[PDB]
Write an enzyme that holds these catalytic residues in place. Structure first.
Site, PDB file in Angstrom:
ATOM      1  CB  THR G   1      -0.941   0.035   1.218  1.00 49.73           C
ATOM      2  OG1 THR G   1      -1.740  -1.154   1.242  1.00 49.73           O
ATOM      3  CG2 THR G   1      -1.850   1.252   1.154  1.00 49.73           C
ATOM      4  CD  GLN G   2       4.198   2.316  -1.938  1.00 47.35           C
ATOM      5  OE1 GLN G   2       4.542   1.247  -1.435  1.00 47.35           O
ATOM      6  NE2 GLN G   2       4.804   3.465  -1.663  1.00 47.35           N
ATOM      7  CG  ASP G  59      -3.215  -1.977   4.131  1.00 45.32           C
ATOM      8  OD1 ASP G  59      -3.699  -2.487   3.098  1.00 45.32           O
ATOM      9  OD2 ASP G  59      -2.271  -1.158   4.109  1.00 45.32           O
ATOM     10  CG  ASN G 108       3.501  -3.057  -0.554  1.00 44.44           C
ATOM     11  OD1 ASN G 108       2.913  -2.294  -1.320  1.00 44.44           O
ATOM     12  ND2 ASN G 108       2.902  -4.087   0.032  1.00 44.44           N
TER      13      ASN G 108
END
Ligand SMILES: C/C=C\NC(=O)[C@H]1NC(=O)[C@H](CC(N)=O)NC(=O)[C@@H](NC(=O)C(=O)[C@H](C)CC)Cc2ccc(O)c(c2)-c2cccc3c2NC(=O)[C@@]3(O)[C@@H]1O
Ligand SMILES: [Mg+2]
Ligand SMILES: [Mg+2]
Lengths: 243, 212, 246, 239, 249, 222, 233, 231
Positions: G1-2, G59, G108
């Site tokens: 996840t960016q 997430d 990441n």
């Protein structure tokens, strides 16, 4: 598991011989006879077609003599398909050398490459060796005309006149008897034709059972693969056949 | 950082400073910029601290390996080229090192090589590397002579490091001085720049601009 | 993917593939090497079977690895080229990474390590070749002669023969090689080499091939005419000995 | 024949190739090591095959590091990779910990390679050579180890391996004590080698070496070994 | 996984390659298939012997198209022929058409399938193909051609030949009946006669397959508007055409 | 946009004595202008009389300390339970740090203990492993505020003998454990006074030939 | 996840004499849009651990699945999963923290701030924090986001040091947590009036209160605010 | 007979022979006994020397501060398995801050050995193990065979003449299971157990090794003079 089925091709006999190498040589012994003779002004290759039938299209048939390069050709004795695999690899290597150095590949370099491929097949991999013997006839500006011979053992040697395939002993004896260092290319043609006609297990030597090639010479060499009519003409001229 | 090495009749003279800075903050002044690769080979730590220290210690390990394999001292050219090939394999990755490998072998004599992170390997007679390389170069090139005695060559290297430490802001701390002969290297003391400056000023009649 | 263990131990403690490679070496042509005071001479037997060979293109038994070191072999010709190529590549690599050509002992050690690896790897048979590596270390005038065996064993020799009938030539050398007085001049060394070969070659000088190595990369192969002259001198001396006995 | 696995267990609970390599070692040359509070001495029988062989080129005693030496017995070609790995492990431990590697640690690291065979984390066959690894460290002083291709290593006060190992071992068992000196160990190694060698022991068919905390691992040159041989002859002719 | 990395076809002390000879024997015990080359086309033919009368013989094709101008028939093991025809159809594009924009010549496609079969005879963990192929093709520069490919990877150009059970007799009949001045219909008639000699059961357009590499059939191209693009030469004869030429005889 | 690094502030200081070593650090862990914790110790005992701190990015510091403790465990396992000398630990930490040369542990590392001769020893490491043994070294936020002070009171820099007119320098001496504790507490109080990232508490680990002991002292919380 | 998409706001937690209390709003924000309500951000693990996750909700669901899988794996071949060999809060934390630091080191990360709160087997109160950077710190009061700025002072007024933990009752701690939730709803644009609250007491056990609402809000004074300075009507 | 070449071949009676050969390799190894009460766990091993000039092969390995094992058979395989067990304990302690359960260690060893007892080209391990540990459940003693069978016991023994020690432990089970909070008494019980398996040998300081773990007692090894009080 699979260990029970491994033939172990790359092992030495108690005598110090490679089993599969000897067996491939024995296989090639039953193949057709190919003879190369290098005169002072050319090279001559003559091979006998083991496969013979009245319906075999000999015009488009090439089972013994192949062109590796505009300067190099090969006479084959043994399994044709293994020979063609090695011939494709040799053509690729020759063109790679040409692309790298912008000069035609010297004969011995190509011969050594093919022989090292054969050798690698006799030392690792557990695969069967190529059942093929090659007679290389080539020309380069270093050694002039060159005749080489390679067998499934991965060994290659140089010759003035050489024979591979069937009845190589009698052919070599006849060549040693009749060969001369000063002879010309037509004399080599006659000698090869007579040696084939005297070492053939067949009744007579005819055009249908023959492949012929001449590497001749300006500053240019000509690699001429004889056509069936040219083969019959050279046979009736050299006195082997009557027309 | 200022490192210098030059070969003369007596052998090789190596002289370095001891200042390590992170901008305007001097991180340390007890840094040893001469890496004792082995009793016969020395290296100068100019550039990235960790890079030079780690890779020259690794070079010493490789030299010991070569001596175990060949039963013979590794040549200065061989070790310098080992380091050069390593840093060239790490080229572009961010290493910054300008070092001098100095040695005294039977086959080569006294030999000094300059190896940089850009892969340049240069055999030379007088080499200065670091932020204050210009000052030491001036002093040496003005007062260099092959016929220098060991004492005079040691003093010349020390004085060049002193000039660099004075003018250059990133060079200073203390001077480390080594003398390499065929029988190996000999440490000739650590000289604090603070006191060395006054000593040289009083004895030499130099640094007249400074008042003391 | 082929990892069949071909070089394995036998109940008595032998590795039969290595011994069979040694037998393959025994079946190869004879080669000898002798140390002079300022030179090393390598002699090799040529197959007196066929006279139709082309002596200009046929690979010679003595091969140069570097400008200062040569390697002769006895055994399978095919397996020898692999070792020669690897040795030349390693010599160039050592020149490139050390800026100093290989020593004879170093090249010999590399070849022996290659052979030992081939005696201990899966899906691989050992080399059926035993080699003699001769030359001079860089900036050194002392002769160097080494022998490598298929098992990976390498050792230095004042003079040594490997190949067919090697026991006879080794007896001849052990009788006629004085460690105290090595062949001083090159002529004496070449004569001793040809004498060693003549106890087994029996046919003529055309079978004997001679190469001489002298310091600072002075490697030269003798022509068949010079070898024949040496053989003629040796035969004349032999007749003189047979007539003086009388 | 070659129709069973190289890692096969015998019905008695042993690996075939390991026992066969032990036989190969039994067919090797003699190597005798003796450890005393003054140092460890290693001697080997060169066993030259022909008088034309230069006995200097028979390196059966090698240096792993300044504080660790190694003698080999058996297929000495197989020992090249083992010696290379031992040297590399010593220098790598030095680089990682700025200290000398312990003798037992080096012997264990070498033995770890033994059973990494079978049918690229494996090799074709176990090693055909045994090693006498002598050394000194600050923890356990002077140490001598016997390392077999079975991955097993033992600390011997005195150990003989190769041909004639049984008698040499018996002699060591009867002639060794905890107060033995360095010269006494040299003379004992020389005597036992001369006893077990088929040839007359001189400075050319035998080779001596020692490991001391001061000088490190020193292989005795032929002249010092010859003087020690003369001393041993004078000791035996007058005993 | 595939631990069979060693060759399964090795040289015997007699010099013979065992599996190759055994595959050739298995070919000899296969249904007869023949090929005859004429002056204006080539013909290949074979007997459609089915396992059960309940099975539909049209769904199983022994004569397959390799390229629009190159087809092939076989004698031996059907599944081997299927996998070989699939491999040949794919290699025609990958190793020629996708590189030169044209369909491969008969000789080169035969050489590619022969290379496949040679690798089968030499590679590790594989048995040779138990088939012999008769490939009839036409290209612009070499004209019409008929090739035979054996399990060993070897190939030979034939004026006319046959393989399978009645191979020898068929070849003899072709040697006695062939000439270099034959039209396509004459070759079809000779092939039908030879097959009738080589079959014992029913002999009609429903029990024999027969294809021809003859003229271009633009009606089979599927599109009109490109004059340079002509129809394919390979055409499998319909049951009606075979029955017509049989009633003619 | 993801920044894999962060700053947790903090200040650590290590002083080496004749027969002892001391490694102290503030117990305050912060992020930007907020306080994350007032007692998150960063000076850890790793056994074998080796105290370690990696001040900076708290995640990287914890990771490096955990890896070094694991290395000491495996060193005992693999080498006959041999004690890890402080120089050996320093070299191992250099290699650990340089392993991530291109992804550095954003932490300045300081270890303290006793050498093989029984003397006090302190080693300092930059984020990529450049290591040096020093008498006194401070790292972290208030490092620039403490290192000069030490130079004036530990190594007696710029201090000359009274009445000698700067001719004779001050004679260097080995400070007692009480003296180095006084100096550490004064340094940390001054850092709390002048630095916003230092305060809450000061934890001192004292390594003597009898082992490691602790000393905690409250600090200002502003 | 960016880059986080659906985000969860603050999480708060504190220690009291017999255990820990954690709480978090039930809002899933699609940036500035209050898109989803009734989104539980407190995940109970067993009878002694609650994990409060703030940040990327995807997430967070990944971590939910990871915790469920960890419970399932600890149940395997473990006849003592009900007692001595049950998942302790420290185990769950250390696992999550290792995962977070690894995800950071691989460039990441899990765009989350996690607070693990529970009671160990011996009764000790466990309260610790981790984030996308892998930073771990433990304090008597722990909060994420705006929580760390606003709730932390109020909660620290109750327990400034560890010595204040034995004196703090469960009622005092719960009242402080509710007041912090109300303050966040006052001054956090991405807050929700609906939240959930977990209490892990070494004696009472795990008490999980859902659908709670902020009550007793002062808004009357807004009637007297006129203009922005000079205006009067 | 014809079914003992690989571990991938099943005998007509359903027996894997190579595994039995490894078990026989264990039987011909040295004797090591293990016994545990509720508070402690003790491994007593008899080391064997090649001759009087050689050392005694170590038979006890420390895996973690709460768990260790004694070996019987091939020392290399024992070292490999103990290193794997060290790695598993290390992974548990680093990723979960959790002492590895002894039962899970036995399960991991079982699966690790089964990996070797079913695949071509791989030989089964040639060593038996006795693992003592102290986890949150208390004291634990496990016996591991390279067949992949791990069994928890109050006491057991493996190696040569192990049946005597096993029968002694069977008879003295109700006695030693109650030796809680007294290390030396359990050590003496283990020494007696291993003595029940001696024939023409006597326990000396040089041939005896002991290992103890338990509550407030990390896995500690006693060799040399440290065992003189138990002889
Ligand atoms: C010591 C003798 C000669 N070498 C120097 O003297 C040089 N290095 C140092 O001082 C310090 C040592 C210290 N303990 O302070 N190194 C770092 O800080 C480290 N930086 C880091 O971790 C960081 O990325 C953070 C931003 C800092 C907290 C290591 C490093 C990394 C990448 C580099 O490209 C360099 C150094 C670099 C290369 C060439 C010259 C110099 C460098 N860096 C400089 O600072 C200098 O300019 C100085 O000259
Ligand atoms: Mg402050
Ligand atoms: Mg404040």
């Amino acid at each position: 598991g699979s260990r029970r089925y491994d033939s172990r091709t790359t092992i030495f006999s108690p005598e110090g011989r490679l089993y599969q190498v000897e067996y491939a040589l024995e296989s090639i012994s039953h193949a057709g006879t190919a003879i190369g003779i290098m005169a002072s002004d050319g090279i001559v290759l003559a091979a006998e077609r083991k496969v013979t039938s009245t319906l075999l299209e000999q015009d488009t048939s090439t089972e013994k003599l192949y062109k590796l390069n505009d300067k190099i050709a090969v006479a084959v004795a043994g399994l044709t398909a293994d020979a063609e695999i090695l011939i494709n690899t040799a053509r690729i290597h020759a063109q790679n050398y040409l692309k790298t150095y912008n000069e035609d590949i010297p004969v011995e370099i190509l011969v050594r490459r093919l022989s090292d491929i054969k050798q690698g097949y006799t030392q690792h991999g557990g695969l069967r060796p190529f059942g093929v013997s090659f007679i290389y006839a080539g020309y380069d500006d270093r050694y002039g005309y060159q005749l080489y011979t390679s067998n499934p053992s991965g060994n290659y040697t140089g010759w003035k006149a050489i024979s591979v395939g069937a009845n190589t002993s009698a052919a070599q004896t006849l060549l040693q008897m009749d060969y001369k260092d000063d002879m010309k290319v037509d004399d080599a043609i006659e000698l090869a034709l007579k040696t084939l006609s005297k070492t053939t297990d067949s009744s007579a030597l005819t055009y249908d059972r023959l492949e012929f090639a001449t590497i001749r010479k300006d500053g240019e060499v000509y690699q001429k693969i004889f056509k069936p009519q040219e083969i019959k003409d050279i046979l009736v001229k050299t006195g082997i056949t009557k027309k | 950082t200022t490192t210098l090495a030059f070969r003369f009749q007596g052998g090789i003279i190596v002289a370095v400073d001891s200042r390590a800075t992170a901008g305007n903050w001097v991180a340390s002044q007890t840094v040893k910029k001469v890496i004792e690769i082995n009793p016969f080979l020395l290296g100068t730590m100019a550039g990235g601290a960790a890079d030079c220290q780690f890779w020259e210690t690794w070079l010493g390990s490789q030299c010991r390996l070569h001596e175990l394999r060949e039963k013979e001292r590794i040549s200065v050219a061989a070790a310098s080229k080992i380091l050069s090939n390593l840093v060239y394999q790490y080229k572009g990755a961010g290493l910054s090192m300008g070092t001098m490998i100095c040695g005294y072998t039977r086959k080569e004599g006294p030999t000094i090589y300059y190896v940089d992170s850009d892969g340049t390997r240069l055999k030379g007679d007088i080499f200065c590397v670091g932020s204050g390389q210009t000052f030491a170069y001036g002093v040496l090139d003005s007062n260099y002579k092959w016929d220098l005695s060991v004492e005079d060559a040691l003093y010349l290297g020390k004085r060049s490091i002193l000039a660099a430490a004075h003018r250059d802001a990133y060079s200073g701390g203390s001077v480390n001085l080594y003398h390499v002969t065929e029988d190996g290297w000999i440490y000739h003391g650590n000289h604090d720049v603070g006191e060395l400056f006054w000593k040289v000023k009083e004895e030499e009649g130099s640094f007249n601009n400074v008042i003391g | 993917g082929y990892d069949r263990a071909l070089s394995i131990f036998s109940p008595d403690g032998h590795i039969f593939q290595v011994e069979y490679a040694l037998e393959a070496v025994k079946r190869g042509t004879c080669a000898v090497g002798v140390k002079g005071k300022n030179c090393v001479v390598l002699g090799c037997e040529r197959r007196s079977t066929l006279k139709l060979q082309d002596t200009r293109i046929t690979p010679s038994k003595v091969s140069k690895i570097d400008s200062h070191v040569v390697l002769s072999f006895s055994g399978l010709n095919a397996d020898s080229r692999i070792l020669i190529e690897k040795a030349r590549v390693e010599a160039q690599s050592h020149r490139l990474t050390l800026e100093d050509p290989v020593t004879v002992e170093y090249l010999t050690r590399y070849v022996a390590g290659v052979q030992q690896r081939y005696t201990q790897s899966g899906g691989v048979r050992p080399f059926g070749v035993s080699t003699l590596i001769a030359g001079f270390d860089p900036r050194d005038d002392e002769p160097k002669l080494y022998q490598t065996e298929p098992s990976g064993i390498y050792s230095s020799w004042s003079a040594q023969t490997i190949g067919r009938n090697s026991k006879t030539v080794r007896e001849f050398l052990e009788k006629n090689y004085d460690r105290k007085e090595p062949p001083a001049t090159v002529e004496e060394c070449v004569k001793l080499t040809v004498r060693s070969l003549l106890e087994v070659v029996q046919t003529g000088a055309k079978n004997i091939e001679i190469t001489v190595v002298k310091p600072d990369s002075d490697i030269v192969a003798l022509s068949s005419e010079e070898i024949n002259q040496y053989v003629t001198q040796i035969e004349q001396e032999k007749q003189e000995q047979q007539e003086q006995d009388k | 024949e070659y129709d069973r696995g190289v890692s096969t267990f015998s019905p008695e609970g042993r690996l075939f190739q390991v026992e066969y390599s032990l036989e190969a070692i039994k067919l090797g040359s003699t190597a005798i090591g003796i450890a005393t509070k003054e140092g460890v001495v290693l001697g080997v029988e060169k066993r030259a095959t022909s008088p034309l062989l230069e006995s200097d080129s028979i390196e059966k005693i090698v240096e792993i590091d300044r504080h660790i030496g190694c003698a080999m017995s058996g297929l000495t070609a197989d020992a090249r990779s083992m010696i290379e790995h031992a040297r590399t492990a010593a220098v790598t431990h030095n680089l990682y910990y700025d200290e000398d590697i312990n003798v037992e640690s080096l012997t264990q690291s070498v033995c770890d390679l033994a059973l990494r065979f079978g049918e690229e984390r494996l090799m074709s066959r176990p090693f055909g050579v045994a090693l006498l690894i002598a050394g000194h460290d600050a923890d356990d002083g002077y140490q001598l180890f016997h390392a077999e291709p079975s991955g097993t290593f033992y600390r011997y006060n005195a150990k003989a391996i190769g041909s004639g190992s049984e008698g040499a071992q018996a002699e060591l068992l009867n002639e060794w004590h905890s107060s033995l000196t360095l010269k006494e160990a040299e003379l004992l190694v020389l005597k036992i080698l001369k006893q077990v060698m088929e040839e007359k022991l001189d400075e050319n068919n035998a080779q001596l070496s020692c490991i001391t905390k001061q000088d490190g691992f020193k292989i005795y040159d032929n002249e010092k070994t010859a003087e020690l041989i003369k001393e041993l002859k004078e000791k035996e002719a007058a005993e | 996984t595939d631990r069979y990395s060693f060759s399964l076809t090795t040289f015997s002390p007699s010099g013979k390659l065992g599996q190759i000879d055994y595959a050739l024997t298995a070919v000899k015990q296969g249904v007869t298939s023949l090929g005859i080359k004429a002056t204006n086309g080539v013909v290949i033919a074979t007997e459609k012997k089915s396992s059960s009368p309940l099975a539909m013989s049209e769904t199983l094709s022994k004569v397959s198209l390799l390229t629009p101008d190159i087809g092939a028939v076989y004698s031996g093991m059907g599944p081997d022929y299927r996998v070989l025809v699939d491999k040949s159809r794919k290699v025609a594009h990958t190793s020629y058409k996708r590189i030169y924009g044209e369909y491969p010549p008969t000789k080169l496609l035969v050489s590619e399938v022969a290379k496949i079969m040679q690798e089968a005879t030499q590679s590790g963990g594989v048995r040779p193909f138990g088939v012999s192929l008769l490939i009839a093709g036409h290209d612009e520069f070499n004209g019409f051609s008929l090739y035979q490919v054996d399990p060993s990877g070897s190939y030979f150009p034939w004026k006319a030949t046959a393989i399978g059970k009645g191979s020898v007799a068929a070849k003899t009949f072709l040697e006695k009946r062939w000439n270099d001045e034959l039209e396509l219909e004459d070759a079809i008639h000779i092939a039908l006669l030879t097959l009738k000699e080589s079959v014992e059961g029913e002999f009609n357009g429903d029990t024999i397959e027969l294809a021809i590499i003859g003229d271009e059939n633009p009606d089979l191209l599927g599109y009109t508007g490109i004059p340079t693009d002509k129809g394919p030469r390979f055409r499998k004869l319909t049951s009606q055409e075979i029955n017509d030429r049989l009633e003619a005889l | 946009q993801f920044n894999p690094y962060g700053d947790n502030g903090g200040t650590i200081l290590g002083i080496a004595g004749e027969d002892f070593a001391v490694l102290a650090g503030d117990t305050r862990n912060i992020t930007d202008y907020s306080i994350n914790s007032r007692y998150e110790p960063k000076v850890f005992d790793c056994g074998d009389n080796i105290v370690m701190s990696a001040n900076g990015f708290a995640a990287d510091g914890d990771a490096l300390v955990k890896r070094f403790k694991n290395s000491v465990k495996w060193y005992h396992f693999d080498h006959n339970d041999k004690k890890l000398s402080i120089n050996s630990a320093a070299r191992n930490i250099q290699h650990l740090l340089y392993g991530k040369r291109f992804f550095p542990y954003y932490v300045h590392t300081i270890i303290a203990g006793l050498d093989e001769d029984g003397k006090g020893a302190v080693y300092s490491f930059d984020p990529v492993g450049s290591y040096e043994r020093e008498q006194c070294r401070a790292g972290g936020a208030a490092a620039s505020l403490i290192m000069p002070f030490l130079d004036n009171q530990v190594n007696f820099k710029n201090q000359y003998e009274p009445g000698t007119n700067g001719k004779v320098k001050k004679p260097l001496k080995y400070l007692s454990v009480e003296e180095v504790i006084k100096l550490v507490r004064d340094s940390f109080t001054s850092a709390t006074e002048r630095h916003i990232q230092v305060g809450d508490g000061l934890e001192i680990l004292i390594v003597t030939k009898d082992g490691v002991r602790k000393e905690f002292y409250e600090l200002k919380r502003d | 996840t960016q880059q986080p998409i659906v985000t969860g706001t603050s999480v708060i937690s504190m220690k009291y004499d017999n255990g820990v209390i954690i709480a978090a709003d039930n809002l899933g924000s699609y940036g500035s849009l209050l898109r989803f309500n009734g989104v539980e951000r407190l995940i109970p693990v067993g009878d002694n651990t609650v994990v409060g996750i703030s940040g990327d909700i995807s997430d967070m669901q990944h971590i939910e699945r990871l915790l469920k899988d960890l419970v399932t794996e600890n149940a395997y071949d473990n006849p003592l999963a009900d007692a001595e060999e049950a998942l302790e809060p420290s185990y769950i934390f250390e696992y999550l923290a290792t995962v977070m630091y690894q995800r950071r080191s691989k460039m990441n990360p899990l765009w989350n701030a996690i607070i693990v709160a529970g009671v160990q087997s011996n009764g000790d109160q466990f309260l610790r924090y981790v984030n996308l950077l892998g930073v771990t710190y433990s304090s008597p009061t722990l909060a994420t986001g705006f929580g760390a700025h606003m709730a932390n002072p109020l909660l620290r007024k109750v327990v400034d040091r560890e010595s204040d933990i034995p004196k703090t009752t469960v009622q005092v701690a719960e009242e402080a947590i509710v007041n912090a939730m109300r303050v966040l709803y006052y001054r956090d644009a991405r807050s929700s009036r609906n939240f959930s609250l977990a209490i892990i007491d070494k004696n009472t056990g795990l008490t999980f209160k859902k659908n709670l609402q902020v009550e007793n809000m002062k808004w009357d004074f807004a009637k007297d605010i006129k203009g922005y300075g000079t205006q009067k009507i | 007979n014809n079914y003992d070449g690989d571990t991938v071949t099943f005998s007509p009676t359903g027996r894997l022979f190579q595994v039995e050969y490894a078990l026989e390799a264990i039987k011909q190894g040295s004797v090591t006994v293990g016994l545990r009460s509720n508070t402690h766990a003790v491994l007593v091993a008899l080391k064997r020397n090649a001759d009087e000039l050689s050392s005694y092969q170590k038979k006890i390995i420390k895996c973690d501060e709460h768990m260790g094992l004694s070996l019987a058979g091939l020392a290399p395989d024992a070292r490999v398995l103990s290193n794997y067990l060290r790695q598993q304990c290390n992974y548990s302690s680093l990723v979960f801050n959790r002492k590895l359960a002894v039962e899970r260690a036995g399960h991991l060893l079982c699966d690790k050995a089964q990996k070797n007892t079913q695949s071509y080209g791989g030989r089964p391990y040639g060593v038996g193990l006795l693992i003592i540990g102290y986890d949150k459940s208390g004291a634990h003693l496990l016996e591991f065979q390279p067949s992949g069978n791990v069994t928890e016991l109050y006491g057991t023994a493996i190696g040569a003449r192990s049946q005597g020690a096993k029968t002694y432990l069977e008879r003295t089970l109700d006695t030693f299971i109650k030796i809680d909070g007294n290390p030396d008494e359990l050590i003496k019980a283990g020494v007696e157990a291993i003595s029940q398996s001696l024939r023409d040998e006597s326990l000396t300081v040089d041939n005896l090794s002991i290992a103890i773990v338990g509550k407030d007692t990390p896995f500690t090894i006693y060799d040399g003079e440290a065992v003189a009080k138990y002889i």
